[PDB]
Structure formats: C-alpha cells, structure tokens
C-alpha cells in the first residue's frame, strides 16, 4: 500500500510501479 505522493500506475498488462508526481519519477520500489 502506497503513501501517496506516489500513485499507482500499472504498465500495460500486469505490473504496478509507484510513481511520484513531485519528483517525477517511476520506481519499482516501495519505500
């Protein structure tokens, strides 16, 4: 479960990566 500065985006089929709007970065990692 993400602490949202991060947003839940899936890549087209399966996978979710946590992406932050303020820093503008896509990470596979959960802080």
């Amino acid at each position: 479960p993400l602490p949202p500065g991060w947003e839940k985006r899936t890549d087209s089929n399966g996978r979710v990566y946590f992406v932050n709007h303020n820093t503008r970065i896509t990470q596979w990692e959960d802080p």
């Binding site: 890549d11 990566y17 503008r24 896509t26 990470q27 596979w28």
Partner: peptide, 9 residues
C-alpha cells in the same frame, strides 16, 4: 535488468 518507463502521462 529491466528499464523503468519514463514519466510522461
């Protein structure tokens, strides 16, 4: 070894 997707909606 995977790339990240770029931040662009």
């Amino acid at each position: 070894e995977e790339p990240p997707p770029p931040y662009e909606d």
